[model samples]
Target: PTIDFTFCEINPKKGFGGANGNKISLFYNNELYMVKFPPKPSTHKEMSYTNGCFSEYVACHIVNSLGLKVQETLLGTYKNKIVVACKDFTTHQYELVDFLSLKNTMIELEKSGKDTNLNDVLYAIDNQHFIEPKVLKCFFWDMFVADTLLGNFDRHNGNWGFLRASNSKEYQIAPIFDCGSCLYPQADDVVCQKVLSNIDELNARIYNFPQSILKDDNDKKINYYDFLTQTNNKDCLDALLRIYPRIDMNKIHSIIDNTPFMSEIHKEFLHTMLDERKSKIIDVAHTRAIELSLQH
Candidate 1:
């Protein structure tokens, strides 16, 4: 269920910069929150306020349901527009560090100028013992799968990282945040309405959706199906299999149904897309498992 923050006070000066939306920091009930507003209509007519807010809310809940950590999120209203607020996870004793910075530090220490990528990250987690190999693999893969399910194409270096204690090098993966780019929030109302009436159009949209940060063996970005079936990594496959049974589709549906300020058309589109994507994910995972077995 969405939390009510209608009466919360906004602090405009605390806003963060990003191309997706205007963010304002706020203090609600003595807790700090980052409230994200939809893209401006003048510049972002293709995006809807309610869709952006609800996408973050739904995606966060879905990640949490998979038994992975994610930032606390809630739907709220500000200046009569629907917005999503994320509770501040950083404290005086701890702070979050971006992956790029951590990767740079690792490379600098090793004096290897190699560029950091998915494979490099996995290697670092093992070589440096930053995190347990199995745990890191599972954590990274779970985030990857959740993004695939949501069609979130923005899990770049800056979007994910680790939380560490003050002046400490040791850390754990940060709770997932900044998920407003998922679930086709960029599609305008006209495009959504058209896709709703045309099955081929909807399928085409899903097929052409862009991938997240991870690329395949060919160095080409891969769609959700390719990520799930063609990655050829046992750890990733195992992670998917472990979390597959834990995903609660019923809870996801309920989240969409309960979100406020969403238009009926928008809600229906989200629900339908998620259902279609979920089936494809399961089928692809099963197919990949069979392929792995045949190799033995």
Candidate 2:
């Protein structure tokens, strides 16, 4: 049985002012949790309501399985609305800061700090003195690779960041959160059944859509398939090398199957979609990255 937080005690309000859905701060076992309620399909009129809470729970678990730090999640119902509770990863002494703020240190661009340009982010990573470029770059690309595997379409600079310590100015890479955008949250039962029935539909999802929020030099969203198959970009290739060895199909399948309250069709959809992306995209990219690593 999963948690039924419908009656959890209230905590001091923490403004979870996020873009995805309604949220409230609550106490579950004396720990502060940011509990998210599934938002209406703001853009997709076809969906009754999005499954972002489910997406958050499942994607965070998958990322955790990859040995990446992810926010803790608990699946439960609140006021009969399916919700996900993410444990607060910070304390009174430590606070969260986003990559957007880090990039603004470039001091040259007038563009909004919300800019999602891929090169600009890389430039910040290379130029930022607060953290070792090598370490930060590795974490960044590792996350990118894992996002590609999860078919994440909405990861941006603002959603990831560092934890500020009391060390005056020292910082640490924050655990992954806001994964509600991953795993095709808008795919309702109808869409899941439709994709599961047709190989063409499944292939389209695997090959075409759910593009990354990160923009290329020309300001176009980076297409995950195109980027991986190009087999260039040493940092990205190195990320695949670092992350590939940790991917276990059985572990991933277990995560999907064990997700609570998910319909069989949804589980199959995730399983099938996940495996295809793994084989056609991640595994293929790893092989090619390794093969090219040998070339010179």
Candidate 3:
């Protein structure tokens, strides 16, 4: 799987266009892969300021290892700076089919005179081609719970999309992406209102979920969806419980881990929310599963 990857200046003509210092370009291997580079320090004083990109790489790998769908990542040092070269998951046209784009997709469906919502669009792709809905739902459910545990705040629509396999004619949810904003709070001073308001509810939903999924021996990864389906959400909860042993509150101890950074109090607040409701999360997940099943 080795290829000669070359770095090129970010093309002004193409990119999700932004003001961020990070550069993005296609690497020249036999095939093209997207390479994203974090901004380098502008002065000696800021030279050691890493953007936590490398930490994000480790976190994503651990997350993927847990059986949630995530893009493959590797470390590449370019020009004395560390960067993440991830498998580019997109079409030639750079369009991504996102599951959370209910408003836009619903509009598209309406234009075609198709009576559908976000779930209906997903169901169409699944049933139209014999894909299993329950199986996929389990994957999504696992992802939601995983983010809750990790305090990943960046799972918005732009960071994810859907892919279609030509041979299978199956629609697949895109691998998870843009997790840099997860565990750590972003540079922004404002706390998102949604997270602040829903922290308690979210925590309770994930705690009681079952974890009946069988972990893959080779990868030591658990099948998140399998747990949800086989044990009536009991399997899912069981899977979450497994993290209890490895979870060290110390890893996330400080809200003001650094003074220049956002106050540690906010981080502590989030951690507290998860801890306070940790015991009851699975019950909420089970209730949600039933409610979603009825809607679909």
Candidate 4:
């Protein structure tokens, strides 16, 4: 699952449509692709456009390696600006329906008694049996672990969804896309330097950073480590333990190491951050495994 690093030229047709930076839709070799640019010069101080592209490029490969569906991503340049391009998964036979839409439908089903949460959404999927329970369980846990490892804080409703048949009601989870915000891509050079120089500070920031906005039943936002420990779903816990050993660190490293136009410091920072996060996630999985056994 080596990422294509060869810079391809993209001819923009129109806006690809997202809240993050500038982007456009184009065709390459008869396949539609959504090409995302780095933040504009005005916002460059606050966002790292290059890192964003790199993050998406690398994250897609990692997700694919974990045996879940993810959009094929490649590194490319458009108008001299580095960008990441994701192949469109939709076709004339299938279309995307975002999680937000599905969640809203579930809320309506609940008679609008209360605001819907993550658990409610999962319950709805299970109730409908859109996909097999075993398959859905694995998909959910795989996505959760992937996000936690990549530091992807932006898996909000709009970022993930299911693909629906254009002619019928058949649906399946959409291949993962829009992962440009992960891996501390927004950190500036100064922040990277500081974090790299201070291991404790880096570890502290990783621990404290809100990995996601997903809240628990008590309405408390949870970080990555806490989510693993607090989640009581035996299915998800088992899924994480099953997939943890299969991740290849060498492949991940090759992707990071070969990212073009990235500084040596940035590369090292990404590698270090991912390595540390891997260790943390494994520790949590082991603890959860033990807890599961004791319950049995």
Top lDDT model: 2
Query: For residues 1-296, could you state the per-residue lDDT of candidate 1 as single tens digits?
Result: 44566677766655564587777788887888888877766564444545667778878988888788998888877777677888877654667776656566675446332333566666655654555667766787788878878888777666777888877878887899888778887666677798889988888656667466555446656677766767677877877777778778888888788877677777788888888778766557756766686854
List candidate 1 stretches off by more than 4 Å.
Answer: 1-19, 41-50, 106-117, 167-169, 290-296
Question: TM-score of the candidate numbered 4?
Answer: 0.86
Model 2 residue 129 CA deviation in Å = 2.8
TM-score of every candidate relative to the true structure: 0.84, 0.94, 0.48, 0.86
Off by over 4 Å in 4: 1-15, 41-50, 108-116, 294-296
Q: Model 3 segments beyond 4 Å from truth?
A: 1-23, 28-31, 39-49, 91-95, 107-132, 165-170, 185-296
Q: What tens-digit string does per-residue lDDT give for candidate 2 at 145-253?
A: 9899998898888889999886558888999999988999879889999999899999899888889999998999998988988947898999899899999889989
Ranking by TM-score: 2, 4, 1, 3
Span of ten consecutive residues with least summed lDDT in model 4: 1-10
How do the residues 68-103 of candidate 3 rate in per-residue lDDT, one tens digit apiece? 678766656556556666666663544455544422
Candidate 4 residue-wise lDDT, 153-267, digit = tens: 7777778878889896688889988888688876767777889899887887578773665666776656887767677777767767877776788988887888777788888
Q: TM-score of predicted model 3?
A: 0.48
Error of 2 at 219 (Å): 1.2
RMSD of 4: 3.5
Give the backbone clash total of model 4. 0
- Report lDDT (CA) for all predictions: 0.73, 0.87, 0.47, 0.73
Cα RMSD of all models vs. native, in order, equals 3.4, 2.0, 11.5, 3.5
1 or 3, greater by TM-score: 1
